[PDB]
């Protein structure tokens, strides 16, 4: 009613304004920072996919438990990525409701999750899924490459037949305007669209190079995500 | 206007905010009160439902400050459902008038007391969560509300 | 005069793309090089230094490589790497400090899985020092 | 006029930038430095009661922050700095008398001053 | 009140905002003034903590707009501590009164100038960041406040 | 001011922001408005120029948030060409004054409407894109603006 009240609310909102305005610009620069780091990993990816592409074309006819399903479907793992902070909008809203679809829509009820962030670990507590280990308040300066040592744990558990499948749910940055939420499979390798006729030779055979390539390709996919 | 309030058994306040929002009759459901609204007179269901919608609309009005500057995405999942229901209830209060038939170009629909309490109950319990909010304006009965939702689909 | 395009790359970023008449690496079997008009080839590269020589030996750039793979693509030859350093930056004082400081903590660590990581890390530190010497 | 001219605009700009202070970790190298001098200028404008400065004392008080002879020094001690400097400058060099008499900063006196500052800066806590 | 203020040496302004929180005596530390709060009178150990307290509380008031709408989640680590410390000192100001045993339902506690200064000084130095803010409500001396935490 | 605004035909708003930036006369081009700015009064050419000038100046004032903190580099590629025009437009509005002769030393400059239109019309079209922005500072006609760029 009184103007003493109004005079407070103006000063209240006007202070809020100056920070939300500041957070707009600080966020503007930070996505442009990470949109470079992601694109700078493409040369590595291109050189990586070319090797595995040739392996797919050769072992296509026969088939492989990476390029095609194992048929066992005995166990599944998942990787989730959310923000530590909030005020994102319907960003973490979409991600956590998209993994809900994957968790539900399975023949196998037994699934394990690996969350990255705060909005993930808080969510997993309430929904009551199989409680794994997590990593939050991530340091970008302490290169995320190093932080992506989760790659080691999942490839080891594929060798032991502890996991027969792996999924990742992240928000792929397409442009500054719009981002496309996605759900890709990692451990079930995606056979390339075009077949490759480039003709390689391997020093320790095809058997060993693939074994050494997988740990590096996983860390790449997680790091890129 | 201040002094007149203390000469009335029932009072129906008309707000410009409601009229401007494009809802008629532009009746404020919280500021409007009647002495008769008591279990004594109107019974159990009438009273129970009337107080419930007030509680919901009050909560919508409380959160309306925060939504204005931030948005709908921020408020919790618990609030989210109450807000969505409130907006439907608010728009359901609108109905066409026989006097304003020439204006609105719609048959003004007299709704009896028993069919209103039925409607606001079903909306509150969340049996019409599937229906859009744009299927409640200038309707009347709840039966006609769903008919408008099917009319869209065609 | 006879040169081909070389490219060193890691997960973080691409490093270089210079012309070279000869290239030097280290394989788990033994040291290996590459000449122009070499046939398509792929192999793992063990923990060891690498060296790149420009056509008509302008310069001989020296680096380090913890792990990675070599790739030959009809003309161009890429060097997939995990960690890469220029030799100059590999200072002895910086690395050696960490060596003895981790050795004491290796005693206290109980689990074998954690030991193997420290057992793997000690190889890397010594290899950086070994590369810098010669 | 030489020292205290652009300083007012700088401060008004600092006030605007001050809102971004909470997100300093990622806010450019250039703008970060503008804040740092913006912090030090505020502390110099701050002074105690019943202790007014003479014109000559104020000239050197402004000089040190504008040119940026406090930008390596921590913000905490920026008030303590000028307190102790003008004690040194009074007794030792007698530059305060020079500035007071002429009432201007020429090239000769300014270079003389810059040396005496560096002398005191190499003797400072 | 406006023309009255001029006549007084010491003024103790009481804020309803503080009374609404339920912390008596509901004294506003930013609006309360005295001509005797100077280096001359109370020395520099007194004068410096008194201001440093007011400086912290002034910052809290500014940040009170942000935590209302945007929340504590969206607040810097540097400021987060100067909020919690500000809330603790705010609640420590409240002490039980002898006359107001009929209200508070506690034995009233006198606290001398020495014991007061040390209590607030210890909160500023970040010693009692371990002790919850609920443990400062209606307590005499800091000694008692630290004790109350584990007591309950 | 309300009853005064009844009689007012146009308004000229001096900005301290533009005065501090070192552009004289200041005259905020967005705040300042007039009745006479219409095709019916001045002409079709004059109108569409003034509009485009203001729309570009507005687009620069929008992207003033980014360039102030981040920089001209850290910006969209497509807008930078329109920003580079905007900065020149704002600096072209600067004008040597006959009264200022005593102070500045530079001789004054009267400028009729037809001379200005052409000048601004060319800039936004993008004929004098290759001309540096420092040449536009305190110059009369567009004829003299291009002349000062070679001088520099």
From Swiss-Prot, chain A:
GO BP: proton motive force-driven ATP synthesis; proton motive force-driven plasma membrane ATP synthesis
Task: Tell me where it resides.
Answer: Cell inner membrane
Name the Gene Ontology molecular function terms of this record: ATP binding; proton-transporting ATP synthase activity, rotational mechanism
Q: What does the entry list under GO cellular component?
A: plasma membrane; proton-transporting ATP synthase complex
Which UniProt keywords are listed?
A: ATP synthesis, Cell inner membrane, Cell membrane, CF(1), Hydrogen ion transport, Ion transport, Membrane, Transport
Q: State the superkingdom.
A: Bacteria
Q: How does it sit in the membrane?
A: Peripheral membrane protein
Question: What is annotated about its quaternary structure and interactions?
Answer: F-type ATPases have 2 components, CF(1) - the catalytic core - and CF(0) - the membrane proton channel. CF(1) has five subunits: alpha(3), beta(3), gamma(1), delta(1), epsilon(1). CF(0) has three main subunits: a, b and c.
Job of this protein: Produces ATP from ADP in the presence of a proton gradient across the membrane. The gamma chain is believed to be important in regulating ATPase activity and the flow of protons through the CF(0) complex.
Q: Which family does it belong to?
A: Belongs to the ATPase gamma chain family.
The name this protein carries in UniProt is ATP synthase gamma chain
In which organism is this protein found? Fusobacterium nucleatum subsp. nucleatum (strain ATCC 25586 / DSM 15643 / BCRC 10681 / CIP 101130 / JCM 8532 / KCTC 2640 / LMG 13131 / VPI 4355)
Curated annotation (Swiss-Prot), chain C:
Question: Which keywords are on file for this protein?
Answer: ATP synthesis, Cell inner membrane, Cell membrane, CF(1), Hydrogen ion transport, Ion transport, Membrane, Transport
The reply to whether Cell membrane figures as a keyword in the UniProt entry is: yes
Q: Which InterPro entries match?
A: ATP_synth_F1_dsu/esu, ATP_synth_F1_dsu/esu_N, ATPsynth_dsu/esu_N
Q: Where in the cell is it found?
A: Cell inner membrane
Topology in the lipid bilayer is annotated as:
Peripheral membrane protein
The GO annotation for biological process reads: proton motive force-driven ATP synthesis
| Superkingdom of the source species | Bacteria
Q: Which family does it belong to?
A: Belongs to the ATPase epsilon chain family.
User: What is this protein for, i.e. what is its function?
Assistant: Produces ATP from ADP in the presence of a proton gradient across the membrane.
What's the protein called, per UniProt? Answer: ATP synthase epsilon chain
Swiss-Prot record, chain D:
Q: Which gene encodes it?
A: atpA
Q: What does this protein do?
A: Produces ATP from ADP in the presence of a proton gradient across the membrane. The alpha chain is a regulatory subunit.
Q: What is the protein name stated in its UniProt record? A: ATP synthase subunit alpha
Q: Which family does it belong to?
A: Belongs to the ATPase alpha/beta chains family.
Q: Which residues form the signal peptide?
A: none
Membrane-spanning ranges: none
Where located?
Cell inner membrane
| Assembly behavior | F-type ATPases have 2 components, CF(1) - the catalytic core - and CF(0) - the membrane proton channel. CF(1) has five subunits: alpha(3), beta(3), gamma(1), delta(1), epsilon(1). CF(0) has three main subunits: a(1), b(2) and c(9-12). The alpha and beta chains form an alternating ring which encloses part of the gamma chain. CF(1) is attached to CF(0) by a central stalk formed by the gamma and epsilon chains, while a peripheral stalk is formed by the delta and b chains.
UniProtKB/Swiss-Prot annotation, chains E, F:
- Protein family according to the UniProt entry: Belongs to the ATPase alpha/beta chains family.
Q: Which domain of life is it from?
A: Bacteria
**What is this protein called in UniProt?**
ATP synthase subunit beta
Which species?
A: Fusobacterium nucleatum subsp. nucleatum (strain ATCC 25586 / DSM 15643 / BCRC 10681 / CIP 101130 / JCM 8532 / KCTC 2640 / LMG 13131 / VPI 4355)
Within the intact protein, the region shown is 309 to 460 of 462
Q: Where in the cell is it found?
A: Cell inner membrane
Q: What is the lineage of its organism?
A: Bacteria, Fusobacteriati, Fusobacteriota, Fusobacteriia, Fusobacteriales
Its function? Produces ATP from ADP in the presence of a proton gradient across the membrane. The catalytic sites are hosted primarily by the beta subunits.
Q: How does it assemble?
A: F-type ATPases have 2 components, CF(1) - the catalytic core - and CF(0) - the membrane proton channel. CF(1) has five subunits: alpha(3), beta(3), gamma(1), delta(1), epsilon(1). CF(0) has three main subunits: a(1), b(2) and c(9-12). The alpha and beta chains form an alternating ring which encloses part of the gamma chain. CF(1) is attached to CF(0) by a central stalk formed by the gamma and epsilon chains, while a peripheral stalk is formed by the delta and b chains.
């Amino acid at each position: 009613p009184g103007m003493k009240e109004i005079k407070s609310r103006i000063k209240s909102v006007q202070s809020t304004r100056q920070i939300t305005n500041a957070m707009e610009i600080v966020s503007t620069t930070k996505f442009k920072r990470y949109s470079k780091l992601v694109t700078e990993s493409r040369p590595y990816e291109e050189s990586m996919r070319k090797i595995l592409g040739n392996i797919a074309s050769g072992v296509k006819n026969e088939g492989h438990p990476l390029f095609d399903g194992r048929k066992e479907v005995k166990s599944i793992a998942i990787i989730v990525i959310t923000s530590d902070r909030g005020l994102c909008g319907s960003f973490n809203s979409s991600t956590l409701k998209e993994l809900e679809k994957l968790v539900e829509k399975n023949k196998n009820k037994n699934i394990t999750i690996i969350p990255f962030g705060r909005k993930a670990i808080d969510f997993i507590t309430k929904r009551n899924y199989e409680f794994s280990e997590s990593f939050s308040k991530i340091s970008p300066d302490e290169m995320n490459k190093i932080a992506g040592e989760i790659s080691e744990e999942v490839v080891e558990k594929y060798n032991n037949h502890i996991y027969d499948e792996v999924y990742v749910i992240y928000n792929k940055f397409i442009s500054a305007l719009r981002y496309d939420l996605t759900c890709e499979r990692i451990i079930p390798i995606t056979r390339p669209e075009v077949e490759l006729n480039s003709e390689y030779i391997f020093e320790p055979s095809t058997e060993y190079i693939l074994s050494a390539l997988l740990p590096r390709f996983i860390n790449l996919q997680i790091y890129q995500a | 206007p201040a002094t007149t309030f203390s000469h009335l058994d029932a009072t129906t306040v008309l707000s410009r905010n409601i009229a401007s929002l494009g809802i008629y009759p532009a009746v404020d459901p919280l500021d409007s009160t009647s002495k008769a609204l008591s279990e004594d007179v109107v019974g159990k269901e009438h009273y129970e439902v009337a107080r419930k919608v007030q509680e919901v609309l009050q909560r919508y009005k409380e959160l309306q400050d925060i939504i204005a500057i931030l948005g709908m995405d921020e408020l919790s999942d618990e609030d989210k459902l109450t807000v969505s229901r409130a907006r439907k209830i608010e728009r359901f209060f609108s109905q066409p008038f026989s006097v304003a038939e020439q204006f609105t170009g719609m048959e003004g629909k007299y709704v009896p007391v028993k069919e209103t309490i039925r409607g606001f109950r079903e909306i509150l319990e969340g049996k019409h969560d599937d229906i859009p909010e744009q299927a409640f304006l200038y309707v009347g009965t709840i039966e006609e509300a769903v008919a408008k939702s099917k009319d869209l689909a065609k | 005069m006879p040169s081909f395009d070389v490219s060193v790359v890691t997960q973080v970023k691409k490093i270089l793309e210079q012309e070279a008449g000869y290239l030097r690496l280290r394989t788990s079997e033994g040291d290996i090089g590459i000449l122009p008009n070499h046939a398509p080839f792929v192999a793992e590269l063990s923990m060891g230094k690498m060296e790149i020589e420009s056509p008509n030996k302008d310069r001989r750039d020296i680096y380090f490589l913890s792990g990675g793979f070599l790739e030959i693509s009809d003309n161009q030859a890429t060097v997939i790497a995990d960690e890469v350093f220029p030799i100059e930056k590999i200072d002895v004082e910086s690395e050696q400090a960490l060596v003895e400081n981790l050795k004491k903590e290796l005693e206290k660590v109980s689990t074998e899985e954690e030991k193997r990581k420290l057992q793997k890390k000690i190889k890397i530190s010594l290899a950086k020092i070994d590369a810098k010497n010669n | 006029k030489q020292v205290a001219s652009k300083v007012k605009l700088e401060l008004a700009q600092y006030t605007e930038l001050l809102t971004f202070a909470q997100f300093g970790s990622d806010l450019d190298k250039a703008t970060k430095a503008q804040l740092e001098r913006g912090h030090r200028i505020m502390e110099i404008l701050k002074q105690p009661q019943y202790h007014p400065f003479a014109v000559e004392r104020q000239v050197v008080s402004f000089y040190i922050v504008i040119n940026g002879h406090l930008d390596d020094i921590e913000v905490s001690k920026v008030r303590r700095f000028e307190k102790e400097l003008l004690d040194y400058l009074k007794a030792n060099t007698n530059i305060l008398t020079e500035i007071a008499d002429k009432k201007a900063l020429d090239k000769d006196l300014e270079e003389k001053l810059k040396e005496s500052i560096a002398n005191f800066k190499k003797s400072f806590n």
